[PDB]
Design a protein around this ligand. Sequence first.
Ligand SMILES: Cc1cnc(Nc2ccc(C3CCN(C)CC3)c(F)c2)nc1Nc1ccc2c(c1)N(S(=O)(=O)C(C)(C)C)CC2
Length: 291
Amino acid sequence: PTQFEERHLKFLQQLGKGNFGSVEMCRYDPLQDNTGEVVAVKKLQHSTEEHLRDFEREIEILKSLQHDNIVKYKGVCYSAGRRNLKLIMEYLPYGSLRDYLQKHKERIDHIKLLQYTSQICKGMEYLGTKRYIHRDLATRNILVENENRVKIGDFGLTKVLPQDKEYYKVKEPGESPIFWYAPESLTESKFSVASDVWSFGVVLYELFTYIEKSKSPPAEFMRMIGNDKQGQMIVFHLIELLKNNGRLPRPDGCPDEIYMIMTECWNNNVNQRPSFRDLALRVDQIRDNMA
Ligand SMILES: Cc1cnc(Nc2ccc(C3CCN(C)CC3)c(F)c2)nc1Nc1ccc2c(c1)N(S(=O)(=O)C(C)(C)C)CC2
């Protein structure tokens, strides 16, 4: 019952476009009586063989995850012979946390941000117990099920660690979200639980800027290295900036202990970054104090 027939997927709209993939809102309505449920359908935008094998691995990863803060796998659809493989997931109605936060910023306070932050930590820790490296954590990948629950919502870049190493080396061709990447990911293409923690620090920054426009990591980092650079030079300068302990600023209104969580996630020393369990503990302690 995790096999969807393509003929019954009714396209409703395009939700998002990304890592060689696209996500659409559809209605699965096999009875053709308009009682089927609305689902999210992910497909490749250009189905090469390398992208198909990556997509199949991403599907297997998501099917292996069951957690309150991980988007639910529903099934696959490939009635177009081999190709046009599509991943069926639950549809979350409030969209990405990036959009949601931006749209409701005047009625989401810091205790609510910390609720979201803690759920993100629990999701990421579960990923780590499976030895999965997410790589692409960002508020655009975090989805809002309702006002009290968010979920990690996309796994297109997630890799499994080798059984004998604590990192995974990978250089994907294309534009990489460098303003969320740990320094050792920029210099050595090394991804680990610790670089996921660096990126989680960027997600926390994102949350506390409420997705204010000029305050995004790309905007702040390009302001710090100078908007006069272009091309590969950008990466180079970013690397230098991070190696001289250049960092994203404290967002307006962010308390010092929250910014300190951020700065501890952004340690150049990979082994000195906190664990996700410790991140959840600290966030939950602060949230309790605020109440
Ligand atoms: C699996 C899933 C489940 N439910 C939802 N619901 C949902 C509902 C509404 C909106 C918007 C649409 C219009 N605006 C105005 C209002 C709400 C929405 F965007 C999503 N979306 C999902 N995936 C999903 C969708 C879109 C994007 C995703 C991921 N990313 S992404 O992960 O980075 C990437 C690129 C796929 C790699 C970034 C964009």
